Short mmCIF file of C-alpha atoms in Angstrom, two decimals:
data_model
loop_
_atom_site.label_atom_id
_atom_site.label_comp_id
_atom_site.label_asym_id
_atom_site.label_seq_id
_atom_site.Cartn_x
_atom_site.Cartn_y
_atom_site.Cartn_z
CA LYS A 1 12.95 -86.08 125.70
CA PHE A 2 15.23 -83.16 124.90
CA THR A 3 15.26 -82.61 121.26
CA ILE A 4 17.92 -79.84 121.20
CA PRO A 5 21.20 -80.83 119.49
CA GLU A 6 19.12 -82.33 116.58
CA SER A 7 16.90 -79.30 116.21
CA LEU A 8 20.03 -77.01 116.55
CA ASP A 9 21.91 -78.92 113.98
CA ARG A 10 18.78 -78.91 111.87
CA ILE A 11 19.12 -74.96 112.21
CA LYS A 12 22.71 -75.15 111.21
CA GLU A 13 21.64 -77.06 108.20
CA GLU A 14 18.84 -74.76 106.92
CA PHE A 15 20.71 -71.36 107.61
CA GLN A 16 23.64 -72.68 105.70
CA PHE A 17 21.15 -73.74 102.97
CA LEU A 18 19.49 -70.18 102.88
CA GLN A 19 22.85 -68.47 102.82
CA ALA A 20 23.94 -70.74 99.80
CA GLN A 21 20.93 -69.94 97.90
CA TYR A 22 21.59 -66.24 98.47
CA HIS A 23 25.17 -66.45 97.52
CA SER A 24 23.93 -68.48 94.17
CA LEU A 25 21.38 -65.67 93.41
CA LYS A 26 23.99 -62.83 94.20
CA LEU A 27 26.41 -64.57 91.65
CA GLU A 28 23.54 -64.97 88.93
CA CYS A 29 22.77 -61.00 89.53
CA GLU A 30 26.38 -59.98 89.02
CA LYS A 31 26.45 -61.99 85.71
CA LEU A 32 23.25 -60.40 84.70
CA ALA A 33 24.76 -56.90 85.46
CA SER A 34 27.76 -57.53 83.31
CA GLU A 35 26.03 -59.15 80.32
CA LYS A 36 23.43 -56.25 80.51
CA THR A 37 26.02 -53.66 80.56
CA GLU A 38 28.29 -55.14 77.72
CA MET A 39 24.90 -55.36 75.71
CA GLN A 40 24.29 -51.78 76.34
CA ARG A 41 27.65 -50.98 74.97
CA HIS A 42 26.82 -53.07 71.94
CA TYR A 43 23.31 -51.04 71.69
CA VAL A 44 25.11 -47.76 71.82
CA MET A 45 27.77 -48.75 69.25
CA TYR A 46 25.05 -49.66 66.80
CA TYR A 47 22.92 -46.72 67.71
CA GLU A 48 25.67 -44.27 66.78
CA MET A 49 26.70 -46.19 63.63
CA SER A 50 22.92 -46.35 62.62
CA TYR A 51 22.88 -42.65 63.17
CA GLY A 52 25.88 -41.68 61.22
CA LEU A 53 24.78 -44.14 58.34
CA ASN A 54 21.39 -42.60 58.29
CA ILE A 55 22.66 -39.06 57.84
CA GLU A 56 25.04 -40.16 54.94
CA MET A 57 22.33 -42.13 53.46
CA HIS A 58 19.76 -39.38 53.33
CA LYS A 59 22.87 -37.20 51.90
CA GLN A 60 23.35 -39.40 49.04
CA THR A 61 19.78 -39.87 48.36
CA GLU A 62 19.10 -36.15 47.92
CA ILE A 63 22.21 -35.81 45.84
CA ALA A 64 20.83 -38.62 43.57
CA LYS A 65 17.48 -36.75 43.25
CA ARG A 66 18.78 -33.34 42.42
CA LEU A 67 21.31 -34.89 39.84
CA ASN A 68 18.07 -36.68 38.31
CA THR A 69 15.73 -33.69 38.36
CA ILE A 70 18.73 -31.70 36.61
CA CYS A 71 18.82 -34.45 33.90
CA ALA A 72 14.97 -34.30 33.57
CA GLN A 73 15.61 -30.39 33.04
CA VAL A 74 18.28 -30.81 30.29
CA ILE A 75 16.41 -33.39 28.43
CA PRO A 76 14.00 -30.83 26.80
CA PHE A 77 17.03 -28.75 25.72
CA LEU A 78 18.64 -31.98 24.35
CA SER A 79 18.16 -33.28 20.74
CA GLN A 80 15.70 -36.20 20.32
CA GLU A 81 18.58 -38.40 19.20
CA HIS A 82 20.37 -37.71 22.60
CA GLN A 83 17.11 -37.76 24.59
CA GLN A 84 16.37 -41.31 24.43
CA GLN A 85 19.84 -42.41 25.02
CA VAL A 86 20.51 -40.48 28.08
CA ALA A 87 16.81 -41.48 29.17
CA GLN A 88 17.65 -45.08 29.08
CA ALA A 89 21.06 -44.39 30.59
CA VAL A 90 19.46 -42.60 33.69
CA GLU A 91 16.94 -45.53 33.61
CA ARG A 92 19.42 -48.25 34.18
CA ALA A 93 21.59 -45.90 36.32
CA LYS A 94 18.93 -46.21 38.97
CA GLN A 95 19.24 -50.02 38.98
CA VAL A 96 21.89 -51.57 41.15
CA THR A 97 22.33 -55.23 41.57
CA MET A 98 23.48 -57.06 44.79
CA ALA A 99 26.51 -58.02 42.47
CA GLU A 100 27.51 -54.40 41.79
CA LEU A 101 26.64 -53.40 45.36
CA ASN A 102 29.15 -56.26 46.54
CA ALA A 103 31.62 -55.35 43.94
CA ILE A 104 32.04 -51.71 44.93
CA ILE A 105 31.83 -52.50 48.69
CA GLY A 106 34.55 -55.23 48.33
CA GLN A 107 36.66 -52.97 46.20
CA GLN A 108 36.64 -49.82 48.68
CA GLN A 109 37.08 -52.17 51.56
CA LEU A 110 39.96 -53.46 49.87
CA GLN A 111 40.92 -49.84 49.55
CA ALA A 112 40.69 -49.31 53.20
CA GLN A 113 42.82 -52.33 53.84
CA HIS A 114 45.54 -51.24 51.15
CA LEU A 115 45.47 -47.64 52.71
CA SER A 116 45.66 -48.70 56.31
CA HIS A 117 49.56 -48.36 56.24
CA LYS B 1 25.76 -66.96 134.09
CA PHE B 2 24.52 -68.23 130.74
CA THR B 3 23.33 -65.82 128.08
CA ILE B 4 21.58 -68.21 125.81
CA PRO B 5 18.10 -66.86 125.11
CA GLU B 6 19.75 -63.20 124.75
CA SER B 7 21.79 -64.82 121.90
CA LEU B 8 19.24 -67.27 120.67
CA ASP B 9 16.82 -64.56 119.97
CA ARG B 10 19.82 -62.79 118.04
CA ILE B 11 20.15 -65.71 115.49
CA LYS B 12 16.39 -65.26 114.71
CA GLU B 13 17.16 -61.41 113.91
CA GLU B 14 19.92 -62.43 111.80
CA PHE B 15 17.86 -65.05 110.09
CA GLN B 16 14.94 -62.86 109.13
CA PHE B 17 17.38 -60.14 108.11
CA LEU B 18 19.16 -62.76 105.62
CA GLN B 19 15.51 -63.93 104.35
CA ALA B 20 14.60 -60.23 103.77
CA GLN B 21 17.93 -59.63 101.91
CA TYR B 22 17.26 -62.48 99.65
CA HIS B 23 13.70 -61.34 98.98
CA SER B 24 14.80 -57.73 98.12
CA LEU B 25 17.91 -59.17 96.02
CA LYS B 26 15.56 -61.33 94.14
CA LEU B 27 13.27 -58.58 93.15
CA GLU B 28 16.05 -56.53 91.87
CA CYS B 29 17.21 -59.59 90.08
CA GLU B 30 14.09 -59.85 88.21
CA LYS B 31 14.03 -56.47 87.41
CA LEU B 32 17.64 -56.51 86.03
CA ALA B 33 16.67 -59.41 83.77
CA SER B 34 13.66 -57.56 82.23
CA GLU B 35 16.30 -54.66 81.63
CA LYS B 36 18.87 -56.84 79.92
CA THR B 37 16.28 -58.52 77.74
CA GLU B 38 14.98 -55.07 76.50
CA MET B 39 18.61 -53.87 76.11
CA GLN B 40 19.15 -56.98 73.86
CA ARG B 41 16.03 -56.15 71.81
CA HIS B 42 17.27 -52.65 71.07
CA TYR B 43 20.95 -54.00 70.25
CA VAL B 44 19.61 -56.36 67.48
CA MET B 45 17.29 -53.66 66.22
CA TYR B 46 20.09 -51.08 66.00
CA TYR B 47 22.28 -53.84 64.28
CA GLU B 48 19.93 -54.84 61.72
CA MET B 49 19.13 -51.09 61.06
CA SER B 50 22.88 -50.37 60.69
CA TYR B 51 23.24 -53.11 58.36
CA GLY B 52 20.30 -52.07 56.18
CA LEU B 53 21.33 -48.32 56.31
CA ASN B 54 24.94 -49.56 55.18
CA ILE B 55 23.69 -51.18 52.15
CA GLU B 56 21.25 -48.38 51.22
CA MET B 57 23.94 -45.75 51.68
CA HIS B 58 26.51 -47.73 49.31
CA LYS B 59 23.50 -47.91 46.96
CA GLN B 60 22.71 -44.50 46.79
CA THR B 61 26.26 -43.20 46.72
CA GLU B 62 26.64 -45.43 43.59
CA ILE B 63 23.43 -43.81 41.93
CA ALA B 64 24.63 -40.56 42.59
CA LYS B 65 28.00 -41.38 41.06
CA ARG B 66 26.31 -42.80 37.78
CA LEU B 67 24.11 -39.94 37.51
CA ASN B 68 27.00 -37.34 37.95
CA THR B 69 28.93 -38.95 35.11
CA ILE B 70 25.68 -38.88 33.11
CA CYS B 71 25.64 -35.08 33.62
CA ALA B 72 29.39 -34.69 33.04
CA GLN B 73 29.08 -36.57 29.73
CA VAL B 74 25.86 -34.89 28.43
CA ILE B 75 27.00 -31.26 29.46
CA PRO B 76 29.81 -31.10 26.95
CA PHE B 77 27.32 -31.65 24.14
CA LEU B 78 25.12 -28.55 24.89
CA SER B 79 25.38 -24.87 24.76
CA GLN B 80 27.99 -22.48 26.04
CA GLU B 81 25.81 -20.45 28.42
CA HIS B 82 23.79 -23.78 29.10
CA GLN B 83 27.09 -25.53 29.52
CA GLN B 84 27.98 -23.38 32.45
CA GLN B 85 24.52 -23.19 33.55
CA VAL B 86 24.48 -27.05 33.81
CA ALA B 87 27.95 -27.51 35.15
CA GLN B 88 27.47 -25.20 38.21
CA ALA B 89 23.80 -26.69 38.63
CA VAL B 90 25.44 -30.25 39.06
CA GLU B 91 28.18 -28.98 41.32
CA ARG B 92 25.72 -27.19 43.52
CA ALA B 93 23.47 -30.22 43.50
CA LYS B 94 26.48 -32.18 45.10
CA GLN B 95 26.16 -29.52 47.93
CA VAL B 96 23.89 -30.61 50.75
CA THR B 97 23.93 -28.74 53.70
CA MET B 98 23.14 -29.88 57.25
CA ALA B 99 20.23 -27.57 57.56
CA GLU B 100 18.71 -29.02 54.33
CA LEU B 101 19.47 -32.56 55.72
CA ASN B 102 17.73 -31.73 59.10
CA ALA B 103 14.75 -30.81 56.96
CA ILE B 104 14.88 -33.92 54.84
CA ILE B 105 15.23 -36.36 57.73
CA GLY B 106 12.75 -34.29 59.67
CA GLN B 107 9.85 -34.38 56.95
CA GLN B 108 10.71 -38.08 56.33
CA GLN B 109 10.20 -39.13 59.96
CA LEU B 110 7.28 -36.77 60.40
CA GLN B 111 5.53 -38.06 57.33
CA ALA B 112 6.39 -41.58 58.24
CA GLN B 113 4.62 -40.75 61.67
CA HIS B 114 1.71 -39.21 59.81
CA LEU B 115 1.11 -42.02 57.13
CA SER B 116 1.15 -44.66 59.82
CA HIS B 117 -1.76 -43.55 61.70
CA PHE C 1 8.27 -76.92 113.31
CA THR C 2 9.04 -73.70 112.01
CA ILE C 3 12.24 -71.88 112.15
CA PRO C 4 11.52 -69.00 114.45
CA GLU C 5 9.27 -71.35 116.76
CA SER C 6 11.80 -73.84 116.56
CA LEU C 7 14.30 -71.45 118.33
CA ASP C 8 11.49 -70.81 120.58
CA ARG C 9 11.20 -74.40 121.24
CA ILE C 10 14.95 -74.64 122.09
CA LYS C 11 14.63 -71.91 124.43
CA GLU C 12 11.66 -73.50 126.34
CA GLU C 13 13.41 -76.87 126.62
CA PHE C 14 16.66 -75.11 127.95
CA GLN C 15 14.61 -72.94 130.57
CA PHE C 16 13.00 -76.27 131.49
CA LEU C 17 16.36 -77.88 132.11
CA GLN C 18 17.51 -74.80 134.03
CA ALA C 19 14.34 -75.20 136.19
CA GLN C 20 15.00 -78.75 136.77
CA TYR C 21 18.35 -78.42 137.72
CA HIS C 22 17.56 -75.78 140.17
CA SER C 23 14.98 -77.96 141.89
CA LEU C 24 17.25 -80.99 141.78
CA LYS C 25 20.02 -78.81 143.47
CA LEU C 26 17.98 -77.46 146.48
CA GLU C 27 16.39 -80.73 147.09
CA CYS C 28 19.96 -82.32 147.05
CA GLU C 29 20.80 -79.87 149.53
CA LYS C 30 17.95 -80.35 152.19
CA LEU C 31 18.72 -84.29 151.38
CA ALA C 32 22.38 -83.95 152.60
CA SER C 33 21.22 -81.75 155.60
CA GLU C 34 18.70 -84.56 156.75
CA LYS C 35 21.55 -87.10 156.05
CA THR C 36 23.82 -85.48 158.38
CA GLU C 37 20.88 -84.91 161.09
CA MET C 38 20.19 -88.72 160.77
CA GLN C 39 23.98 -89.59 161.07
CA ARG C 40 24.16 -87.32 164.30
CA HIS C 41 21.14 -89.09 165.90
CA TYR C 42 22.78 -92.63 164.72
CA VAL C 43 26.06 -92.10 166.44
CA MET C 44 24.21 -90.81 169.40
CA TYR C 45 22.03 -93.77 169.89
CA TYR C 46 24.81 -96.31 168.98
CA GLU C 47 27.02 -94.87 171.77
CA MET C 48 24.01 -94.61 174.27
CA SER C 49 23.41 -98.33 173.35
CA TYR C 50 26.97 -99.19 174.19
CA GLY C 51 26.53 -97.46 177.48
CA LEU C 52 23.04 -99.18 178.34
CA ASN C 53 24.95 -102.38 177.32
CA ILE C 54 27.53 -101.93 179.81
CA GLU C 55 25.53 -100.95 182.62
CA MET C 56 22.92 -103.64 182.00
CA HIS C 57 25.35 -106.69 181.83
CA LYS C 58 27.09 -105.08 185.17
CA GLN C 59 23.70 -105.07 187.09
CA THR C 60 22.81 -108.14 185.80
CA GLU C 61 26.26 -109.86 186.96
CA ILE C 62 25.87 -108.25 190.37
CA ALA C 63 22.32 -109.72 190.77
CA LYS C 64 23.61 -113.09 189.76
CA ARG C 65 26.31 -112.95 192.38
CA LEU C 66 24.04 -111.54 195.16
CA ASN C 67 21.52 -114.32 194.37
CA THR C 68 24.26 -116.95 194.59
CA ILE C 69 25.19 -115.42 198.07
CA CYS C 70 21.62 -115.63 199.25
CA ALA C 71 21.54 -119.03 198.02
CA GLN C 72 24.62 -120.18 199.93
CA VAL C 73 23.87 -118.11 203.08
CA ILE C 74 20.21 -119.75 203.48
CA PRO C 75 21.19 -123.05 204.62
CA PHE C 76 22.59 -121.68 207.99
CA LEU C 77 19.30 -120.37 209.09
CA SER C 78 16.09 -121.74 211.18
CA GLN C 79 13.74 -123.91 209.02
CA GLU C 80 11.20 -121.09 209.25
CA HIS C 81 13.70 -118.47 208.48
CA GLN C 82 15.12 -120.29 205.57
CA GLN C 83 11.40 -120.63 204.08
CA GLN C 84 10.88 -116.90 204.61
CA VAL C 85 14.12 -115.71 203.20
CA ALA C 86 13.85 -118.12 200.08
CA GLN C 87 10.50 -116.91 199.41
CA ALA C 88 11.62 -113.50 200.02
CA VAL C 89 14.40 -113.72 197.31
CA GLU C 90 12.53 -115.70 194.55
CA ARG C 91 9.94 -112.87 194.85
CA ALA C 92 12.78 -110.26 194.56
CA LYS C 93 13.72 -111.42 191.30
CA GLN C 94 10.30 -110.79 190.22
CA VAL C 95 9.62 -107.33 188.65
CA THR C 96 6.34 -106.91 187.14
CA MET C 97 5.87 -104.44 183.97
CA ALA C 98 3.93 -101.94 185.88
CA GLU C 99 6.56 -101.26 188.55
CA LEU C 100 9.07 -101.44 185.74
CA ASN C 101 7.32 -98.71 183.83
CA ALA C 102 7.32 -96.78 187.33
CA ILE C 103 10.94 -97.12 187.79
CA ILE C 104 11.70 -96.35 184.10
CA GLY C 105 9.29 -93.57 183.88
CA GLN C 106 10.60 -92.16 187.08
CA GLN C 107 14.43 -92.15 186.36
CA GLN C 108 13.25 -90.76 183.05
CA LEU C 109 11.67 -87.90 184.95
CA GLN C 110 14.88 -87.70 187.15
CA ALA C 111 17.45 -87.53 184.05
CA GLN C 112 16.29 -84.04 182.95
CA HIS C 113 19.21 -81.56 182.26
CA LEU C 114 17.70 -79.87 179.03
CA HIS C 115 18.42 -86.62 175.87
CA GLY C 116 16.51 -89.36 174.62
CA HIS C 117 15.86 -93.14 175.79
CA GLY C 118 12.21 -92.65 175.59
CA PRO C 119 9.58 -95.67 176.25
CA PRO C 120 8.01 -95.49 172.84
CA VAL C 121 10.01 -96.58 169.76
CA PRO C 122 9.52 -93.82 166.95
CA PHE D 1 27.41 -63.93 109.52
CA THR D 2 28.21 -65.48 113.04
CA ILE D 3 25.54 -67.92 113.27
CA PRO D 4 27.07 -71.39 113.19
CA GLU D 5 29.51 -70.29 116.14
CA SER D 6 26.33 -69.22 118.05
CA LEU D 7 24.66 -72.59 117.65
CA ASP D 8 27.70 -74.72 118.30
CA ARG D 9 28.16 -72.75 121.52
CA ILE D 10 24.37 -73.35 122.36
CA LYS D 11 25.22 -77.03 122.00
CA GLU D 12 28.16 -76.91 124.03
CA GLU D 13 26.36 -74.95 127.08
CA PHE D 14 23.37 -77.31 126.88
CA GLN D 15 25.65 -80.47 126.91
CA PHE D 16 27.56 -79.00 129.83
CA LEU D 17 24.10 -78.21 131.72
CA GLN D 18 22.83 -81.72 131.20
CA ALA D 19 25.95 -83.37 132.21
CA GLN D 20 25.84 -81.39 135.46
CA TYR D 21 22.24 -82.47 135.89
CA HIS D 22 23.14 -86.08 135.25
CA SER D 23 26.18 -86.00 137.86
CA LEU D 24 24.01 -84.00 140.37
CA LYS D 25 21.27 -86.64 140.15
CA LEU D 26 23.73 -89.44 140.58
CA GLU D 27 25.18 -87.91 143.41
CA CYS D 28 21.81 -87.15 144.88
CA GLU D 29 20.61 -90.76 144.50
CA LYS D 30 23.60 -92.11 146.20
CA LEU D 31 23.28 -89.88 149.00
CA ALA D 32 19.70 -90.46 149.45
CA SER D 33 20.67 -94.59 149.72
CA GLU D 34 23.11 -93.55 152.35
CA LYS D 35 20.92 -91.59 154.29
CA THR D 36 18.21 -94.29 154.29
CA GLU D 37 20.85 -97.03 155.37
CA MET D 38 21.64 -94.48 158.15
CA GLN D 39 18.04 -94.21 159.02
CA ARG D 40 17.86 -98.03 159.40
CA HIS D 41 20.69 -98.06 161.87
CA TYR D 42 19.51 -95.31 163.89
CA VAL D 43 16.11 -96.90 164.24
CA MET D 44 17.81 -100.23 165.23
CA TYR D 45 19.89 -98.31 167.88
CA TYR D 46 16.72 -96.56 168.95
CA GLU D 47 14.66 -99.81 169.83
CA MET D 48 18.04 -101.29 171.12
CA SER D 49 18.28 -98.41 173.38
CA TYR D 50 14.74 -98.77 174.57
CA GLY D 51 14.99 -102.59 175.62
CA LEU D 52 18.51 -102.00 176.97
CA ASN D 53 17.29 -99.29 179.25
CA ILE D 54 14.45 -101.50 180.38
CA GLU D 55 16.45 -104.46 181.18
CA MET D 56 18.92 -102.38 182.82
CA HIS D 57 16.43 -100.84 185.32
CA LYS D 58 14.94 -104.25 185.96
CA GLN D 59 18.28 -105.93 186.86
CA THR D 60 19.35 -102.91 188.91
CA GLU D 61 16.09 -103.28 190.96
CA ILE D 62 16.48 -106.90 191.63
CA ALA D 63 20.02 -106.00 192.64
CA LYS D 64 18.96 -103.54 195.11
CA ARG D 65 16.43 -105.93 196.46
CA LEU D 66 18.72 -109.09 196.87
CA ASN D 67 21.29 -106.79 198.40
CA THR D 68 18.80 -105.45 200.86
CA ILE D 69 17.99 -108.99 201.86
CA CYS D 70 21.59 -110.16 202.33
CA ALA D 71 21.60 -107.00 204.60
CA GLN D 72 18.60 -108.51 206.46
CA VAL D 73 19.78 -111.95 206.85
CA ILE D 74 23.46 -111.23 207.84
CA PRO D 75 22.90 -109.91 211.34
CA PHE D 76 21.72 -113.53 212.55
CA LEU D 77 24.84 -115.18 211.63
CA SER D 78 28.04 -115.97 213.78
CA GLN D 79 30.53 -113.11 213.79
CA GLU D 80 32.95 -114.74 211.46
CA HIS D 81 30.36 -115.84 209.23
CA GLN D 82 28.88 -112.26 208.92
CA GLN D 83 32.40 -110.85 208.16
CA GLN D 84 32.74 -113.50 205.43
CA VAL D 85 29.15 -112.80 203.93
CA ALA D 86 29.55 -109.07 204.20
CA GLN D 87 33.02 -109.32 202.33
CA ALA D 88 31.37 -111.59 199.71
CA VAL D 89 28.52 -109.07 199.34
CA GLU D 90 30.88 -106.14 199.11
CA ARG D 91 33.06 -107.95 196.53
CA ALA D 92 29.89 -108.88 194.38
CA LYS D 93 28.83 -105.29 193.82
CA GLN D 94 32.34 -104.61 192.44
CA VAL D 95 32.55 -105.49 188.82
CA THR D 96 35.94 -104.95 186.96
CA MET D 97 36.68 -104.26 183.45
CA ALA D 98 38.02 -107.55 182.74
CA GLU D 99 35.05 -109.34 184.38
CA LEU D 100 32.32 -107.22 182.29
CA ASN D 101 34.38 -107.68 178.99
CA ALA D 102 34.77 -111.33 179.70
CA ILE D 103 30.82 -111.30 180.17
CA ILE D 104 29.78 -109.17 177.29
CA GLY D 105 31.32 -111.79 174.84
CA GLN D 106 29.55 -114.61 176.64
CA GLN D 107 26.97 -115.71 174.29
CA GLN D 108 29.44 -115.64 171.64
CA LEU D 109 31.98 -117.61 173.63
CA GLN D 110 29.26 -120.03 174.67
CA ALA D 111 28.90 -122.46 171.66
CA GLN D 112 28.82 -126.17 170.99
#
């Protein structure tokens, strides 16, 4: 008639179960925290990087314009035999293929490698 | 004497305490997951950004180079006063101050903000 | 079959068992007391029975002896005297239930000191 | 963080309590049987006491009467005869331990 030891052992079971589920969730949490933090460090890294890159990019863009404007302003004082040539020159100058890009990048990277001494 | 009930009720207390801890911790966990997800999003964003900005930076640098060479070649085939004029003009065109830059990036992001209504 | 109400159930059953043990305990004690009382009365009435046994067998023997003596002394008498005495003795060996109740009830009323041996049987 | 300990402790105390209840119950029941057996005996010796009392007083009375009529008959005898009968009656009312002992175990020593 006395359902005590079975009930108490049942309790031992489900307490231990709850405890286990807790600890599981806690480990999961700790992982989430770590991975989130590393993710954040990456985020900051490329944030700052994109920042500096942005600044230098705008810089070179403005320099490029200014040089072009200068060209557009020396052309009228230039002779019609020289005008056409330098016009075409500036035309193509504005065109940069992925091959050229890859070439100057690869070269200057190689330079950084060879200067890393 | 046997102090059962007194202890029995105690284990109930510790139990409800445990389940409470599980609940609150779970809420914290879900929040943390959302946060990490958002962090990852911005990581990949600033990454792709950094990439594009790198490529574009090298592009603009190359264009500026080419155009500067164009000027440095055209200028000696001009006038004496105009030769000096253009020389100084170019060597000043290379000069980009941080104030000017702040202005450029400003107007860029402001007009980006406005053109995208 | 919840978790908290489970613990409550545990308590309930335990308190129940505590109560049960208490009741059983006091019942066991009153029980033992009753036992010792019964034992006392037992020894008492056994011993009393031994006494009554001895006395009964004694008076029985004395009576038998005296009857024999009368039996032997009778044939010495006159014919009428013999009849009278024989009648007298065989009438003497007759006690009814009324007079037996009388002597018993009396000797009872005489044996008072403030014992037992009462005429009913409860 | 100290819950399984508690539970096993509860189990221990409960098992203790019920073991004690079992033992106390068994002892109680054996004691009950003993009490009842005794009661049987006390009843037995009660009714025995009753009967023994009745027969004791009956035989006592009979003895008294017979003695009285011996006393009645005696004075009508010759002197020597009177002395003999008086001595015999006198002796009769004297029962010794060996006599009554040998008498108590009569029914038993009277078989076949």
